[PDB]
Amino acid sequence: QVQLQESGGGLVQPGGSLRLSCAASGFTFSNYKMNWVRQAPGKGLEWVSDISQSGASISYTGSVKGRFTISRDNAKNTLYLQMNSLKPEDTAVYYCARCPAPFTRDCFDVTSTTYAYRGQGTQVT
Amino acid sequence: SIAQARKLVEQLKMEANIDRIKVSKAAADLMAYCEAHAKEDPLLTPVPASENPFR
Amino acid sequence: QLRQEAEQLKNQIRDARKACADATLSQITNNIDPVGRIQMRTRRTLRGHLAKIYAMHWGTDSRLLVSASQDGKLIIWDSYTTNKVHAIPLRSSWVMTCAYAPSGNYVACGGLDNICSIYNLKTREGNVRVSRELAGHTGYLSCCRFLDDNQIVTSSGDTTCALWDIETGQQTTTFTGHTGDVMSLSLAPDTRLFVSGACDASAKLWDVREGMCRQTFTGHESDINAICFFPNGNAFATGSDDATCRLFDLRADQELMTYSHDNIICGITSVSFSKSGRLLLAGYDDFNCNVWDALKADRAGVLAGHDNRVSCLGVTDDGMAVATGSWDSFLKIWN
Amino acid sequence: TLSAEDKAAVERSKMIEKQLQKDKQVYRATHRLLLLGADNSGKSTIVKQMRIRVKTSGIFETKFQVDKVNFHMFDVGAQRDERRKWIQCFNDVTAIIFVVDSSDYNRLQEALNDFKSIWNNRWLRTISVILFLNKQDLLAEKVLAGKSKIEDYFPEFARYTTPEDATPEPGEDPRVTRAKYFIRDEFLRISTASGDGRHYCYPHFTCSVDTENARRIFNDVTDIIIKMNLRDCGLF
Amino acid sequence: XXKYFP
Amino acid sequence: LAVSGVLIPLVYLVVCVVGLLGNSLVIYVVLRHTASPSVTNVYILNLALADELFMLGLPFLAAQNALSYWPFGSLMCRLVMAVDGINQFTSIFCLTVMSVDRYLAVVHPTRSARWRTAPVARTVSAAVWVASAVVVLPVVVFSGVPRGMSTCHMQWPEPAAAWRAGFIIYTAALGFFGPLLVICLCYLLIVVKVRSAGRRVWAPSCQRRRRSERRVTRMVVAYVALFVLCWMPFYVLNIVNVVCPLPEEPAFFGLYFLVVALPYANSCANPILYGFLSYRFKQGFRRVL
């Protein structure tokens, strides 16, 4: 079954850094486009970053563009996210979403409240 | 919501205690069923051009 | 706490499968002779539709077949003579599914509107009119097949299904197990149990008598588009967007064989079994359909000729011919 | 030869074919559009400019005639946040009017992501998107107040410059002009990244008090039809 | 004359 | 004398084989892969068929220009003298009908859908064929080898005083002016319509500068430029003689060989223009090869 388990979240002071790691199972991680989103207390699902299958095409949201780095590891089917220059605004639960269909550039419902192809996420504060 | 968690736990417990037969018997049953109706399958058994209603 | 316990149960279930997975279907079924290369030819080309066709269903007599066009038209074609028998205009243009009643007296249809409206075909005056509207769902109707002349099941995009009575039109049995939008359903030969697929890469069986999820099957990597029971009623095939069809047996509670190919990277839109079940006809977005061997996973035939995505595929009750309808506004019958 | 029932069947089929072609005439005569946007996008107001059933209804239709041409705008009603399935049903519509509130810098990223998804959609690659930058007065007021900076959400704005191709309106602060042109280029870049000449975006600066929206929609649909007729022959 | 020189 | 038989036949045959290159490529990619989606492919492959027939008729005259005798008899002489003319007029009327259809499609989007169909396409194709036949009627009724020693040509019933020049001017007028001016009108009206439509709809779309709009403009102007520069010399250098007999010269037989091959160059470019430089045709061309 499709499963995504995130880890690496924890308490950190402003300016620190965190390496979030998401392990995927139940599908070919190398043939799916991945995205990292975040949800803050009270607000909704906020898109953070996106990475393609191979990793040549990467995108980041302007709010965090310049300090976050997303990467993939097909040899282990893992999604890594290095976050630096943390600020109080980054306090939120980070989730990892997978595109609905493989070999597709568009990724719909990634910010949907109900999404089966999404892990439980990790809380950062 | 924690109620959906209890509902899912109950559903899994209800589905985790069902009688399951080995895959071998299911494969044998499928094979026997396909072999019994193989002749009654026009697609798998092409028939002459005298009983096909589409002509 | 109730989330950890839950996952434990999963392992248990998985372990159970490990106790029943003795051998693979391809291994035990290897000595039988191959079906060969089935070359299905086009015999009838039904034309006349305006917009993309979205669904169709064969009748119990293997003569009339209903087809739905999102231009708002339900056309009942006589497959033998191709003569148009009935042309019902729909109030809601966007229709996504249609179903032919077993008695041949009613025909149901649904789409973006949360109503699987039914139309009577044997009125006393000879004309067709709105017979009943089954409203109440909060999502588009994916499929609502007829279970009898009084009861009708309907799957909605709200992750739930409902059994309505044509007489009263009220929900008689509700199913709220699925987490994603229900995309397709398949009834059993005895109309007692029925399987339903959703966008959560999971299929669920439901009993029409009790209305509870007794078995849940997984294995797909994306949304399950099509689902069809096996002619014997003990198994069922499911086709998803992962360009792979999976056969799940209700008695074994585990996948038996997988149908996929490297050259195929497109999703599945239709699936149907022959009268014997040896051949599985699956429609793909590559403008063609594949005839796989249910017991060998070998592609026996490639039905090509369409110029657009295949929307619906339906085999007759006698397994004589198969009607394929695509978005090109034309249906093709292969025999 | 044929049976007596065959004659009646053929006559019924002929009548049904006549009805079907009569319906196809009007079907090809009328145009269909798909309205999309968030809750704050103000779709209700733009839909309320139609100057020419069930509580759980999942689709609302609005028919309006402009220059003797009929246009039916469809907007999804009672539907869940997931839209990757039913959206494919609109792979043959004439155009997709996507509304955005340009004044809301918070959800602007969500609107950009939604526009990118709709543009890169496999089945919507051959459909143009009419972008109506509604609520321009609110954007102008927010820019004149200066209480919320745009660089907080889009750092590239700090390096953006007013293009000479702009057409400032009389009595418009240059700040509002550059802000609206930047939030327009934000969508135009995504549109052109995967345009391929098969589809184009039509941005327009609209507001709550605006009646010419129908004229803009008509002109955009006419241009789309012209481009389609051109591509049909290959002159393209 | 025609497709010939004369 | 000799240098003519050395160069003229070579260029004639190479023009014929390049025309057959284009015709066969287009006809294959059409009949096999892009098979009957609308009137467009019908008209295109009809033009290709006309041009291919013209090419297959070429070798006869190509060899006659070097042998100076038609030993095959009156049968094939008259047959090919009529076939070449009907093929020329059919290839021209095909371009005319293509221009008219494109004009109707871009301007009358409504009546377009109403009239553009495959049965109507085949009907107008047959009509163009029979019209080429009925307009070359003079070419075939005047066709006769006996009225001359060896040259396989036409018979002018009366001196060139009022018939040779008359027939030349008639065929020139028709073939050049009618088709050419109709095509030009259609294309420039299409340009006017698309410009009026675009200027009223977000002119800054950035395609007006060096893209699809400009590609269409360049293609529609190159059509006219090529058609003119290829056909006009043929119908022009034919009248420079009936009005003043040019003193027999190798350079004058060249001058003519050139103006008679120029229409074959047009028949060779037409495939290049339409089939190769188009959309959804180039798609299959790139897919199969």
XYZ file of C-alpha atoms in Angstrom, chain C residues 122-316:
195
model
C -41.946 1.644 -22.069
C -44.380 4.457 -21.295
C -48.037 3.967 -22.179
C -47.877 6.865 -24.663
C -44.661 5.620 -26.299
C -42.618 8.708 -25.398
C -39.820 9.056 -22.839
C -40.098 11.285 -19.775
C -38.378 11.873 -16.445
C -39.501 9.053 -14.149
C -37.580 9.863 -10.953
C -34.615 11.914 -9.737
C -32.321 10.448 -7.062
C -30.742 13.544 -5.511
C -28.924 13.937 -2.212
C -25.261 13.329 -2.997
C -22.584 16.006 -2.613
C -20.490 14.845 -5.577
C -20.641 13.897 -9.223
C -22.186 10.505 -9.961
C -19.428 8.159 -11.112
C -21.672 5.161 -11.828
C -25.164 3.990 -10.819
C -25.981 0.505 -12.115
C -29.359 -1.205 -11.829
C -29.724 -3.942 -9.214
C -33.438 -4.574 -9.870
C -36.607 -2.907 -11.131
C -37.028 -1.200 -7.726
C -33.555 -0.774 -6.179
C -30.562 1.000 -7.714
C -27.047 1.594 -6.386
C -25.262 4.888 -7.047
C -21.620 5.795 -6.423
C -20.853 9.477 -5.841
C -17.684 11.542 -5.723
C -18.253 12.305 -2.031
C -16.440 9.059 -1.087
C -19.777 7.322 -0.419
C -22.343 5.147 -2.185
C -26.103 4.928 -1.711
C -28.833 2.407 -2.523
C -32.073 4.120 -3.570
C -35.580 2.840 -4.259
C -37.007 3.907 -7.618
C -40.472 4.069 -6.040
C -39.683 6.372 -3.103
C -36.257 7.669 -4.129
C -34.732 7.690 -0.635
C -31.416 6.295 0.569
C -31.941 2.722 1.773
C -28.313 1.775 2.501
C -25.281 4.056 2.800
C -21.621 3.093 2.356
C -19.005 5.503 3.740
C -15.830 3.424 3.788
C -13.929 4.849 0.831
C -11.581 7.780 1.421
C -11.349 8.993 -2.185
C -13.884 9.737 -4.893
C -15.561 6.501 -5.974
C -14.765 6.085 -9.673
C -16.463 2.809 -10.635
C -18.435 -0.142 -9.297
C -19.126 -3.727 -10.347
C -22.039 -5.878 -9.201
C -21.949 -9.622 -8.594
C -23.889 -12.195 -10.642
C -26.358 -12.684 -7.766
C -26.628 -8.924 -7.045
C -25.766 -9.685 -3.402
C -22.251 -8.199 -3.200
C -20.605 -5.448 -5.229
C -17.090 -4.014 -5.433
C -16.275 -0.315 -5.706
C -13.049 1.501 -6.558
C -12.007 4.981 -5.437
C -9.155 7.450 -5.938
C -7.307 6.087 -2.874
C -5.745 3.117 -4.720
C -8.077 0.780 -2.828
C -11.109 -1.330 -3.727
C -13.854 -2.256 -1.273
C -16.512 -4.969 -1.297
C -19.988 -4.265 0.073
C -22.990 -6.479 0.809
C -26.345 -5.107 -0.331
C -28.083 -6.880 2.569
C -26.009 -5.665 5.533
C -24.153 -2.748 3.946
C -20.737 -3.224 5.569
C -17.215 -3.388 4.151
C -16.178 -7.031 4.520
C -13.006 -6.983 2.392
C -10.564 -4.274 1.303
C -7.976 -4.736 -1.451
C -4.900 -2.612 -2.174
C -1.829 -2.746 -4.394
C -2.391 -0.012 -6.961
C -0.040 2.967 -7.156
C -2.611 5.560 -8.292
C -6.349 6.155 -8.589
C -8.400 3.126 -9.617
C -10.348 4.122 -12.730
C -12.233 0.946 -13.692
C -13.349 -2.165 -11.809
C -15.188 -5.228 -13.116
C -16.220 -8.459 -11.417
C -15.139 -11.853 -12.741
C -17.777 -13.910 -14.608
C -17.718 -16.413 -11.724
C -18.138 -13.739 -9.037
C -15.150 -14.884 -6.955
C -12.606 -12.365 -8.303
C -12.507 -8.937 -9.915
C -10.109 -6.887 -12.033
C -9.152 -3.269 -11.355
C -7.474 -0.810 -13.712
C -5.815 2.363 -12.418
C -3.729 5.231 -13.803
C -0.479 3.315 -13.159
C -0.819 1.539 -16.541
C -1.381 -1.750 -14.712
C -4.397 -3.998 -14.151
C -4.655 -6.124 -11.006
C -6.850 -9.166 -10.344
C -8.020 -9.570 -6.736
C -9.838 -12.672 -5.484
C -12.457 -12.295 -2.758
C -11.849 -15.792 -1.366
C -8.044 -15.478 -1.293
C -7.925 -11.787 -0.282
C -4.759 -11.091 -2.268
C -3.656 -10.193 -5.779
C -3.246 -13.190 -8.084
C -1.609 -11.780 -11.226
C -0.515 -8.381 -12.532
C -1.056 -7.147 -16.099
C 1.402 -4.475 -17.232
C 4.049 -3.716 -19.840
C 6.972 -1.315 -20.097
C 5.695 0.103 -23.394
C 2.419 1.039 -21.644
C 2.693 4.085 -19.373
C -0.868 5.385 -19.785
C -3.799 4.975 -17.434
C -6.691 2.552 -17.828
C -10.214 3.755 -18.630
C -12.232 0.557 -19.154
C -12.064 -3.124 -18.213
C -14.329 -6.041 -19.093
C -14.185 -9.840 -19.027
C -15.474 -12.223 -21.676
C -18.204 -14.768 -20.973
C -15.481 -17.210 -19.881
C -13.117 -14.685 -18.278
C -10.014 -15.986 -20.061
C -9.627 -12.671 -21.925
C -9.575 -9.246 -20.252
C -10.343 -6.293 -22.533
C -8.815 -3.114 -21.085
C -9.065 0.309 -22.706
C -6.109 2.684 -22.509
C -5.533 6.364 -23.247
C -3.301 5.420 -26.216
C -6.403 5.314 -28.487
C -6.318 1.490 -28.434
C -7.436 -1.404 -26.239
C -5.546 -4.508 -25.115
C -6.819 -8.080 -24.777
C -4.759 -9.610 -21.968
C -4.740 -13.260 -20.906
C -6.327 -13.470 -17.458
C -4.251 -16.592 -16.722
C -1.019 -15.665 -18.551
C -0.957 -11.827 -18.723
C -0.079 -12.115 -22.429
C -1.491 -9.404 -24.698
C -3.420 -11.379 -27.318
C -4.827 -8.496 -29.371
C -4.524 -4.745 -29.850
C -7.835 -3.194 -30.916
C -6.860 0.031 -32.696
C -8.718 2.493 -34.892
C -9.928 5.154 -32.475
C -8.642 8.727 -32.733
C -9.229 9.747 -29.100
C -9.208 8.459 -25.538
C -11.285 5.336 -24.936
C -14.097 6.161 -22.507
C -16.130 2.955 -22.156
C -15.868 -0.737 -23.012
C -18.699 -3.230 -22.639
C -18.960 -6.944 -23.440
C -22.308 -8.575 -24.154
